[PDB]
Amino acid sequence: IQRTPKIQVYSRHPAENGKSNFLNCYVSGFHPSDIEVDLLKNGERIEKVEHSDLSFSKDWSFYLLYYTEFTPTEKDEYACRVNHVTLSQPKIVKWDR
Amino acid sequence: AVVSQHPSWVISKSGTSVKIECRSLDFQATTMFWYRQFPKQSLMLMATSNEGSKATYEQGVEKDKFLINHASLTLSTLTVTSAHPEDSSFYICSARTSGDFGEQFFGPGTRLTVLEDLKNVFPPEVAVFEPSEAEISHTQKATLVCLATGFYPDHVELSWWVNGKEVHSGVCTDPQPLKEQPALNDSRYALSSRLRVSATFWQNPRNHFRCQVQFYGLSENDEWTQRAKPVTQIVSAEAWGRA
Amino acid sequence: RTHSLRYFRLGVSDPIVPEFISVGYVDSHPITTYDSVTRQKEPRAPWMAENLAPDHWERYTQLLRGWQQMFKVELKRLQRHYNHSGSHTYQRMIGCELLEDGSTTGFLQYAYDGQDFLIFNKDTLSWLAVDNVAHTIKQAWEANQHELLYQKNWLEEECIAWLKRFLEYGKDTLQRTEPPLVRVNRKETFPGVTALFCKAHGFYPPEIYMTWMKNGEEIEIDYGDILPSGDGTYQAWASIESNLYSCHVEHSGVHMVLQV
Amino acid sequence: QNIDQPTEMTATEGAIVQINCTYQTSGFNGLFWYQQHAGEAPTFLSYNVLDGLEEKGRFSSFLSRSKGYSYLLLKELQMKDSASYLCAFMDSNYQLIWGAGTKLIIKPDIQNPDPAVYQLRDSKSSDKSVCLFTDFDSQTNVSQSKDSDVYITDKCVLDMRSMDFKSNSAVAWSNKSDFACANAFNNSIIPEDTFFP
Ligand SMILES: *[C@@H](C)/C=N/c1c(NC[C@H](O)[C@H](O)[C@H](O)CO)[nH]c(=O)[nH]c1=O
Ligand code: NA
């Protein structure tokens, strides 16, 4: 058995174009541990992007949180690019404002 | 589980380096311990041997005098660099179980005695004493006495042998040996043992009694200048039944 | 409040990614970490480092170094007993549960390839195997009755001892309460149709309970998972599509009603 | 954080003996009882981690984690039991904390004594001889020589299991010209009914 990740991309406090917020991507319920993930600004890898360490859930699967400081724009599109064993092609989850 | 540690007894000069090996004959030990018991004191821990890690020492222990290393997963070796008569003691090896509850398995021995001069090593002289005619008359029993005398250091093991078999029933051996000249330190010792048997048993002339004293003396790879070399040997005294 | 202490162990047969990792948690907080590439037990929360003596880390590091070695050997044997080709994973989990009502829970489990393998019953002092391979491990672990006894007491008394201690060391983080910010907004989930979202955020502990009502009757309800915001606080939501509805919400003792 | 147990204990052969061990610690992961005969390594006796008394033949091991207390109970006591009994527990960080150990001294039950001093002669030599004070009560204790040329051993108990018989014995010898068996054990207070041939 191999568990595929659950990708949830969202803002910290409720977003409004102008104010400074945080963009989180929460990859969870995946198995095994090896996972590569990056955040995108219209298909561009954000250089400075802090993240939590590999965390362990009771159901035996794992979870991570990748976050970045950002200011929303009505024109700019944001997404999360995850690559894991179960994903034959790398999955891109766009942020729904 | 069993742990074995070689040598069991060792005599070495002041300044040399003695190495006590220790092996777990069945399972692999991730951690092994080094204990010491000065006469008379509790069993004190002196070091902790760990595979793929360094050696942890205790309060007294000086990392410069002892050299413990985890050779294999089955082997740990303590090496006393530049030995001194103060270092002479009983060195027990230990190996912890795989399980977390921490039961240890101990190696038997080792008895190390450091001597500044080896010209003080003397093997024992053994004499046996036939039972008193008055004892048989009164008690209707016959106590035999043995004597291991003028041996140094206290590296002896006494055993009784009735008609070829080692006997424990009716035996009594001194736990501690007597200093012949207690005034002077590095004195020679004397040890006695008893063998009380039935009145009729000792009166049978075909019955054979023999007091055996094992001596754990010097090595082949030790040098002698003198007197015959006081090496590891057995010295015995006999007795036959008398009516 | 109801709290937990649980340590996880992970072994990988073909590393890149460390061969072995172990991490501890008080509730959802990582408090300790050890890996095969550092070979040193380190703290994760600052209040751990502040309160535990330098000797503590030294002693559990030698423990963990030895535990890593046992995990190596166990995973090789499991791999061979299965004649399992490729990469495989071994996982251990041990914990505590000091419930609000003073009662406790203890658990110890193993998992090969992320699926339950050996489950420990601390009342029967037995192991629960999932198949013929797990079973031959069970047969061996059930042999040493002393270890089974040692385990029951570690879980029942020692584990809770440690948990309660940590709760005092980090009472400002673990024993805090940061109440939620609840908001109701109407947003057409498809053409014509209209749903009500009960978005809640900035709360701690992460345990929350959202739900909708129809004049009093429980409603059919769409939900949002509890998610970390990144500031140490969590966020969540719930939704439903002539009747008067209300978002009844419960978090850390206090219960809210938001009639819309 | 420390452990405590008596230094020494003396008891008559054939009766129950309770070696109490009391600790105090922040953490506890079990208590061990080890047996260690003089000049030998220790050997495992028990492991108690849960509350209650646990039997294992003639020996028993009790534990009260709540009272931070354990005891080794040796019943139907024997001469072979004269050993040292080590107590140790596993603390919070899995370190074994040893006690100093109780030295157990088993005095025998000499119910039919006839204190007598005897003279023995060497198998090969003529001038060589030893005096033996045997079959004396456990009440009577043998005091060492205050003389440098006279040698006196302490009492030793020997079991003649084929007959259920025990006896205390002390040996004394010297090269001294005037060494007699009637003056051999004068340094000790011996029974007034002691036999001399
Ligand atoms: C620092 C205290 C790290 N501990 C640690 C533990 N601790 C729990 C317990 O002592 C251990 O699981 C025993 O094996 C239970 O029988 N466990 C762990 O998995 N990793 C750790 O880093
Ligand atoms: Na402690």
How does DSSP assign B117-168, residue by residue? -GGG-B--EEEEEEPPHHHHHHHSEEEEEEEEEEEBSS-EEEEEEETTEEE-
Q: Are C127 and C118 spatial neighbours (Cβ–Cβ below 8 Å)?
A: yes
Q: How far apart are CA A15 and CA D120, in angstroms?
A: 108
**Which residues neighbour D143 within 8 Å (Cβ) at sequence distance 6 or greater?**
D152, D187, D188, D189
Please indicate whether, in this complex, the C-beta atoms of C33 and A53 are within 8 angstroms of each other: yes
Q: Are D86 and D33 spatial neighbours (Cβ–Cβ below 8 Å)?
A: yes
Find, among B204, B207, B196, the residue nearest to B163 by Cα.
Answer: B207
Q: What is the fold of D109-197? A: Immunoglobulin-like (2.60.40)
Query: D1-108 in CATH: which number?
Result: 2.60.40.10
Burial class (CB in 10 A: 0-12, 13-18, 19+), A89: exposed
In this structure, what token pair is assigned to residue A6?
A: 């659950």
| Residue pairs between chains A and C whose CB atoms are closer than 8 Å | 64
Q: How far apart are CA B19 and CA D168, in angstroms?
A: 42
Q: How far apart are CA D133 and CA D131, in angstroms?
A: 7
Q: Are B90 and B36 spatial neighbours (Cβ–Cβ below 8 Å)?
A: yes
Bridge partners (DSSP) listed for residue A28 = A6, A63
The response to whether C88 counts as a known ligand-binding position is no
- Write down the experimental method used for this entry: X-ray
Angle (nearest 5°) at CA C51 between C47 and C55: 130
Q: Does A51 touch chain C (CB under 8 A)?
A: no
Q: Is C25 in the pocket of ligand 1 (CB under 6 A)?
A: no
Q: How far apart are CA B55 and CA B35, in angstroms?
A: 14
B64 and B177 in a single domain? The answer is no
In this structure, what token pair is assigned to residue A41?
A: 């600004």
**Which residues neighbour B185 within 8 Å (Cβ) at sequence distance 6 or greater?**
none
Q: Identify which of B42, B131, B134 has the shortest CB distance to residue D100.
A: B42
Amino acid at A95: W
| Residue count of chain D | 197
B6 and B38 in a single domain? The answer is yes
State how beta strands B9-13 and B111-115 pair: parallel
Amino acid at D101: G
Q: How many domains does chain B have?
A: 2
Q: How far apart are CA B157 and CA B11, in angstroms?
A: 16
In this structure, what token pair is assigned to residue D18?
A: 């309770």
Q: How far apart are CA A5 and CA A55, in angstroms?
A: 13
What separation, in Å, do the N-terminal and C-terminal C-alpha atoms of chain B show? 51
Instruction: Give the number of other CB atoms < 10 A from CB of residue B236.
Output: 14
Which domain does B215 fall in, by range?
Answer: 117-243
In this structure, what token pair is assigned to residue C14?
A: 């073909």
Q: Identify which of D36, D43, D128 has the shortest CB distance to residue B43.
A: D36
Q: Are C181 and C201 spatial neighbours (Cβ–Cβ below 8 Å)?
A: yes
B8 and B103 in a single domain? The answer is yes
Instruction: Render the burial of A7-25: b for 16+ CB within 10 Å, e for the rest.
Output: bbbbbbbebeeeeebbbbb
- The alpha carbons of chain B give a radius of gyration, in whole angstroms, of 22
Q: Does C150 touch chain B (CB under 8 A)?
A: yes
Q: Whose CA is nearest to atom 14 of ligand 1?
A: B100
Helix C132-141 with C54-82: angle, nearest 10 deg: 140
Coil, helix or strand at residue C60: helix
Which domain does A3 fall in, by range?
Answer: 1-97
Residues flanking ion ligand 2, Cβ below 5 Å: D 25-27, 91-92
Please indicate whether, in this complex, the C-beta atoms of B30 and C69 are within 8 angstroms of each other: yes
**Of all atoms in ligand 1, which is nearest to the CA of residue C151?**
16
Q: How far apart are CA B189 and CA A91, in angstroms?
A: 86
Q: Distance of CA C248 to CAs A13, A75, C185, C233, C259, Å? A: 22, 37, 15, 21, 8
Q: How far apart are CA B199 and CA D136, in angstroms?
A: 19
| Residue count of chain C | 260
Give the residue from B65, B99, B116 where a domain finishes.
B116
Please indicate whether, in this complex, the C-beta atoms of C66 and B103 are within 8 angstroms of each other: no
Q: Whose CA is nearest to atom 16 of ligand 1?
A: C151
Q: How many domains does chain A have?
A: 1
The response to whether C139 counts as a known ligand-binding position is no
Task: Name the resolution in angstroms.
Answer: 3.3
In this structure, what token pair is assigned to residue B36?
A: 């010491």
Please indicate whether, in this complex, the C-beta atoms of C228 and A24 are within 8 angstroms of each other: yes
Find, among A14, A8, A21, A18, the residue nearest to A63 by Cα.
Answer: A8
Coil, helix or strand at residue B187: coil
Q: Does D1 touch chain C (CB under 8 A)?
A: no
In this structure, what token pair is assigned to residue C231?
A: 């500031």
Q: How far apart are CA C48 and CA C252, in angstroms?
A: 25
Query: C1-176 in CATH: which number?
Result: 3.30.500.10
Q: How far apart are CA C114 and CA A1, in angstroms?
A: 7
Amino acid at B186: D
Q: Are C204 and C236 spatial neighbours (Cβ–Cβ below 8 Å)?
A: no
Q: Is C152 in the pocket of ligand 1 (CB under 6 A)?
A: no
Q: How far apart are CA B169 and CA B210, in angstroms?
A: 15
Question: Quick one: CATH architecture of C177-260?
Answer: Sandwich (2.60)
List the CATH number of the domain containing A87.
2.60.40.10
Please indicate whether, in this complex, the C-beta atoms of D169 and B174 are within 8 angstroms of each other: no
Q: How far apart are CA C179 and CA C214, in angstroms?
A: 25
Q: How far apart are CA A75 and CA D189, in angstroms?
A: 112
Task: Show the beta-strand stretches assigned E in C27-76.
Answer: 29-35, 42-43
Within 13 Å and on the Cβ side, how many CA atoms surround D125?
Answer: 12
Q: How far apart are CA C127 and CA C134, in angstroms?
A: 10
CA of C54 vs chain A CAs: smallest distance (Å): 24
**Which residues neighbour B96 within 8 Å (Cβ) at sequence distance 6 or greater?**
B29, B30, B31, B32, B33, B102, B103, B104, B105
How does DSSP assign B46-84, residue by residue? EEEEETTS--EE-SS--TTTB--B--SSSEEEEEESS--
Residue given tokens 């020589």 in the structure block:
D145
Interface test with C, best of A60, A67, A93 (most C CBs within 10 A): A60
Amino acid at D100: A
Bridge partners (DSSP) listed for residue C191 = none
Give the residue from B116, B145, B167 where a domain finishes.
B116
The response to whether C122 counts as a known ligand-binding position is no
Q: Distance of CA C17 to CAs A54, C10, C12, C33, Å? A: 11, 11, 9, 15
In this structure, what token pair is assigned to residue B163?
A: 């008609």
Find, among B40, B41, B45, the residue nearest to B60 by Cα.
Answer: B45
Helix (H) or strand (E) holding B228: none
Q: How far apart are CA B52 and CA C65, in angstroms?
A: 8
Q: How far apart are CA B109 and CA B4, in angstroms?
A: 9
Bridge partners (DSSP) listed for residue D133 = D117, D170
Q: Does B107 touch chain D (CB under 8 A)?
A: yes
Q: How far apart are CA B82 and CA C101, in angstroms?
A: 63
Find, among B35, B10, B43, B36, the residue nearest to B89 by Cα.
Answer: B36
Q: How far apart are CA C219 and CA B58, in angstroms?
A: 68
Find, among A59, B24, D131, the residue nearest to C8 by Cα.
Answer: A59
Sign of CA dihedral A15, A21, A23, A29: negative
Per DSSP, C155 falls in state I
Residues spanned by CATH 3.30.500.10 within chain C?
Answer: 1-176
In this structure, what token pair is assigned to residue D54?
A: 């646990």
List the CATH number of the domain containing B8.
2.60.40.10
